[PDB]
Amino acid sequence: MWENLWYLDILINVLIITIFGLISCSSSATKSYDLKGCFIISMVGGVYDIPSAILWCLASLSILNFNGFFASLFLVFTWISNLFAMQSLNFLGIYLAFEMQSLCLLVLGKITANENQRWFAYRGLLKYLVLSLIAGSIFIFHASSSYLQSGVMISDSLVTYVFLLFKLGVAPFHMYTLELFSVVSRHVAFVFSTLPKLSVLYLISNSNIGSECVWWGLISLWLGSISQYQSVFVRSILLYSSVAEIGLVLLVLQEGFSWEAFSWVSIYFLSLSGVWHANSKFVSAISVASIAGLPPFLGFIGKAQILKSLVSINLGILIFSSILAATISFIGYLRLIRLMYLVSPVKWKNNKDSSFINWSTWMLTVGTLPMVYSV
Amino acid sequence: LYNAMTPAQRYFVEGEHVVQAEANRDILFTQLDSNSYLPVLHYVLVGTALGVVFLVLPLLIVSFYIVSIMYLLFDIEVVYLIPYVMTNATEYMYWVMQTFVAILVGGFFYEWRMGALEWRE
Amino acid sequence: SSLFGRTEVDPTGKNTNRNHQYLYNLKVLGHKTYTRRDPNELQKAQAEVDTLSAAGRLGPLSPF
């Protein structure tokens, strides 16, 4: 009964915070800092390893910028889904955790849209939903055929690999990210383009869910880079950058380089935080540079880990593609830098809510030298 | 009428008497058709025919959406509770059920607190 | 559990890597293993049953 207590504590904690927030709901404290702190303390009870500690760090940072009890509760639900995804041992754990996370995305997207923004937000949420239903239905149908043929539910199968490919958003399963994340709030797009990835990478690495095929990462790298170069809108540039990078990361993760993907996801989170939560031109420039991979910033270390892993596998086509695609991506990032300081006078809203943004910019600048041992 | 098709299903009984007896049998609950839903479908057909006969005889001569969603989710919660009542529960099965009920009562409390249960809207 | 599980390190070092699924099935469900009876024992026992039946001590194979 003692092993069960560890899991039970999380539920008890979430329920009591939920009912406390409901009972103590008032206009005087719309930003429930106390509940945010209780949720952060609660999520420390699920840290068991280093990946769980990274999941906690990212969830806490995401929770800081959500406003209101409701949004923070749905982030805790996302965290619970992510924690269970890492521990999934068969098809049922994978399906259950990922579909719960999809539900939390649908709610978070819906509750962060203004009345004037409902026409486009609800359309993008509906398109995301229908595509998610296609993915889940094909997954469960194939899983049923596999369970019937083999008699057992084994997470080492092509069915799970293709499903996790959809979840990562590589090859041709990246369009939901483009459609949904363009029409949603900047914070929601940022937290759901980084945090979910860690769980999928952990599942792939731990459950041996790798394929010999390199076509999907090669496709994601080239499509993402070319689409980033041809995209007029800045949201699309940022969205396609993640497609390209996660394609390369997928290629690296299939070959067993788990440590490098777990370090990359953390650096990418810190790099994306300042560009997405744009308030200052300088913070945004340092973020764009880190995503680009410029050497003085922590982004260089993250890209270096992936490139270093690529040279070990000794696949020439991947290295050539990587160099050319990286150059094409660099042109898009230069476009972003040009738009801020070299095109026209820029005036932005004074949204002075830089919770972890200053810390992230500092961590990007300063972190390169401490983490130099990795590369 | 489902019919056994293998010797093992027929309790390794040989002959063709058994096959004929099985095929021409009547639905009896204390024989080979126990817990059978075939009578229910015979009842559905009889009821439909009776209605069709009556129907044809003369011819010759936002709150609602909310209640629907809450109903569906509470109904699934009750569907989960149905297996528990169908077992002789132990102390640990009781506490799992209590956690489930606590989660349901929390969702109910949220509905009450937020004014969904009131039907003024 | 059946669907979820986490891994921790052993400080003592006695416990080692084995299939988690096998260990779980052994602990929760258990493995039933059966042998095959050697022919000589079976032949003697069957002959004994037949001998008793011929003597008439044993009852009928079918009641009616």
Added chain:
Amino acid sequence: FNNVPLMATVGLLAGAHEAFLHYERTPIYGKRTYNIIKKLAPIVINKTAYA
């Protein structure tokens, strides 16, 4: 003959792409005098053959 299946598949994917783009634009609500398949089949066939 062993290696052409790849080229044929790529040609079929390209032709299906272009045919879909043409089909999507055509309006369901308005009745069309012409047969859509007769318009679309050359696209796919020609692309596959050339590839």
Added chain:
Amino acid sequence: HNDAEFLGAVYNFSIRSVFITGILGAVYWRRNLITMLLCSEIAFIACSVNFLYASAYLNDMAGMLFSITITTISACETALGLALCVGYFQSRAANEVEALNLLK
């Protein structure tokens, strides 16, 4: 010669047809959003039936638990999607005609 082999083949054909009709039916014959979600439900039901069939074939409870999971998740997904559809329809501008029919 074997009824069960014939019945198994018939079941496999039927279930596969129902799955493809659900997944590709509403998109093929362009329909409203409400029909797309109904066909998605049909597909999920087909998969859950396949799991129940497998559980009966292998005398195992895993399919029955996956199937209850499908029932729960599918209903939650439908409820959320229908809420989104209503919200989308209430915000439609006068010019927009078939707002629900995206595939037009």
Added chain:
Amino acid sequence: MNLNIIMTVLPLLVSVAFLTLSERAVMGSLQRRMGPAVSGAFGILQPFWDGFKLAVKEPILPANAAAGIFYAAPLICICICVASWCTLLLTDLSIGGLFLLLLSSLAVYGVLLAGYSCNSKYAFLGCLRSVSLMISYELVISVVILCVILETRDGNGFPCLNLTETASQTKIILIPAGLLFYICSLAESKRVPFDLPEAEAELVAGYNVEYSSLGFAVFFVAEYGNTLLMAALINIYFLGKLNSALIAAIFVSFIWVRGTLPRYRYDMFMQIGWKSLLPVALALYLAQASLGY
């Protein structure tokens, strides 16, 4: 088939007709009137006159409505009532009462389809109100049934919901849950306290009012049949073995409560079912669960 179906359907038809006669006989007695005496002398034949006359009336061709759904609604109700009674009296289904619960959730379709036939903006709200009442008090009925299954075990000790086994023993512990089952049964039959219709239906807001022939006949007959089924369920679950006298007495009780209680507004009854009946039924469930086996 079996000869039993005849022995079930025919008594249901006779009984429903006299249920209709009883409704007015009791209401007259309460209001110092007398049972109808111009139809005949004994008064036994009074319902047959109404049914036979309703047959004679000239059919009206359907207007601005789909023909299929219009025909379907009577067939659906006449099917549910038959299946219910024949699964209540002629089956051994281990979870038979759960099947009855499923058959009671399908009664919502007939009302909804009738509302759809009107295709009126007001009628859309009126049907939504009726279905809201049925689903809201069906949830409470489901929780009450859960309470019924904790106390119902068979001789072999296997938990189940066989109507014969629940009927075999009478448990006074369940009586607190029988009161809720009785209030919900009143709600599901749209009796006076929960009779939102009548006030809304004075004007043609929408309801089965549209039919005026064999279609209207089956609906009213089904209404009484469902009320009698609820009375049978109250007898079988909370009052022991099936007794014809008890079923009739419970129906009479329904009529009495109807007469003595005013109707409720839409918000009031729904607020009763969600914030009053449901917490009570959940407390009774948790209490029975905690008592143990």
Added chain:
Amino acid sequence: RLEAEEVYTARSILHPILQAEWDLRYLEHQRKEREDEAKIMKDVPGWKVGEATSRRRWLPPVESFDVRPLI
């Protein structure tokens, strides 16, 4: 609880006898089947009657008398 324990005891007593008579009936039927199979396969060369499908464990018949479709 006491009636249930009585019924369980009785059933646990009857189960060995019912399984023993089922096993014996199975054995006579399988013998008859193998006799017919050998008769049919006399012409075919390189055919061994009574070959073991499973090397070690006994394979029970998938279909059983107890489980009959509800409909």
Added chain:
Amino acid sequence: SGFGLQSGTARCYDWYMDYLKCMDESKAPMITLRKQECSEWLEDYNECLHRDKLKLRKLLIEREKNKQEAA
């Protein structure tokens, strides 16, 4: 899972557990190698699940019986 429908365990749980035990005994440094060593146990589990060999045997017997009957 591994649990049975009525009670006990699945119809072919023991065969799978046999194969898992064989893999546990093996000392091969990779899972692929161990599966190669324990392939015969997997063939037994697959055989119990689908009875493919018994179906083939029955098909051959039926076909030969038909040939004899026609002659």
Added chain:
Amino acid sequence: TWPKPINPYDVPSSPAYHRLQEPSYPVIDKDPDFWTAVSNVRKEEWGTTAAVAAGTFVMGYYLGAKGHTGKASAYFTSFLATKSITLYHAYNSADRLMGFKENSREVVKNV
């Protein structure tokens, strides 16, 4: 085959989560209760519990004051953190009693 008889009252059941490990150390208690585990918690762990409780009271008050509900937040946060740390300490002590983890002090203190 024949269906095995099932006793409804005694149907085999197990908890969801199982620790797959043989006890390295002696088993003081095979199945410790909550109170037994709580009674075996070390003094240092109780000190950690009290330090956490005080720190979370101060942090709760600080965060609550921005929303005009300092006292309520302080008490809730204290209770929540104390409860979680206490459950963690009890889980560790139960594992020590079961012999999974080092129990030198535990065996000596309660023979």
Added chain:
Amino acid sequence: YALPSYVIVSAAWAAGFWAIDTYQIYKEGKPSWNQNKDQFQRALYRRDWYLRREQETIGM
């Protein structure tokens, strides 16, 4: 008067209940046809049916 209508309902349902009870007890052969049966009881009834048919075949 409520009593005559009530009596007719009571008597009609009593007659129906008696008719179904007797009919079933005549065909099924026992008053316990409706009682709940578990897997073991269902298998026992099935075995009894097949054994009776075997006995009939053996006798003739």
Added chain:
Amino acid sequence: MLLIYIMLSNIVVLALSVVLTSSPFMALMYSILLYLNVQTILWSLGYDFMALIYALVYVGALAVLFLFVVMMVRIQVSTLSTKTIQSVLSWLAIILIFSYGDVSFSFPCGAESLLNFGTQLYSSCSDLTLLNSLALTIALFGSLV
């Protein structure tokens, strides 16, 4: 055997009817009949409670939700009939292609028991029951706002 075959074959006609019909209200009615046919298929595999579950959750509750939405959003979709002979045969061809030559397995019959299902759901498999409850809570909270 005929009844099982008829139900299995019918499920295809009831699925084709949903997509072909142009009325959203009528499509739900065909889906309801499909759900009932699925309940009857489940009865042939030996499941009673599971088949009850499908009808309760889908027919009893989900269909009501679909009708509520359809009434609120009512649109004029009787524009034109586009069911040309060419389109239907192409659809039936796509269906036949996808649903052909897959691995088939002998039809099984398996008696189910609630005692075992309840025991497993609330003991060995308690992790699933609570995550499902959390999913329902997530849906409740998100749908109501």
Added chain:
Amino acid sequence: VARVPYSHELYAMAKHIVFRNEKEHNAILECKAQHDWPEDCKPESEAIVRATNKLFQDIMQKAPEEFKDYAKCLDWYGLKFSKCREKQAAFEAAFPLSE
């Protein structure tokens, strides 16, 4: 062909079997637990089948009416022991168990 008495009969003689036939019951249980194959357990199956049939025959002579009456009562009440207490007590008195 191995056959044993009908359900009602087996229930009526169930208490007697464990007192009188202990040897065969234990043997069959042990062999069945040890060996899966039905041929391996054929002697013990034959033994317990013959023993049960012999018990049925000696009960049929010693207490013909009492057994028949109990078996009919059990069959009438759907194999429920509780409802037949009087007949069971009479049959047990007429034919004592454990010799």
